[PDB]
Amino acid sequence: GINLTPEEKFEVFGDFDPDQYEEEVRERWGNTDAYRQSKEKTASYTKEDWQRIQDEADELTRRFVALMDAGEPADSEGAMDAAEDHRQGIARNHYDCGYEMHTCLGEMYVSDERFTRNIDAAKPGLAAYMRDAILANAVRHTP
């Protein structure tokens, strides 16, 4: 499973504790494929893996903010391509995700602000932009 110390968790995510939420997801979905795969592969994931990934999310954020804050619409060629990046790297770190699959993840993204507050810590008013950018992206990439 996840190999991190309360003090180390923060070094990689910063406040996000999987153990506490581990129990919570168990009750919420306690049987979804996306979740089972996380447990499946994560058991093999080390710190080096999560950090390379977090740095990945950060980078992904850096472009979203530079492009998003630019007042660029979420269905922008610039925004749509962002989502492409979002799907590629995210699926390979937790589970093979489809357009229909996580596009919806994108809409429920706002429902549990636990996600939004940790993500938006980098920019106020982004969790929602990701949702429109990601959801829209699935529209054109879903034939």
Binding site: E22, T32, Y35, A57, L105, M108
Partner: peptide, 12 residues
């Protein structure tokens, strides 16, 4: 889904 809190989830 997945973690409640970093980026994947549960619900489609």
């Amino acid at each position: 889904s997945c973690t409640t809190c970093e980026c994947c989830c549960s619900c489609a």
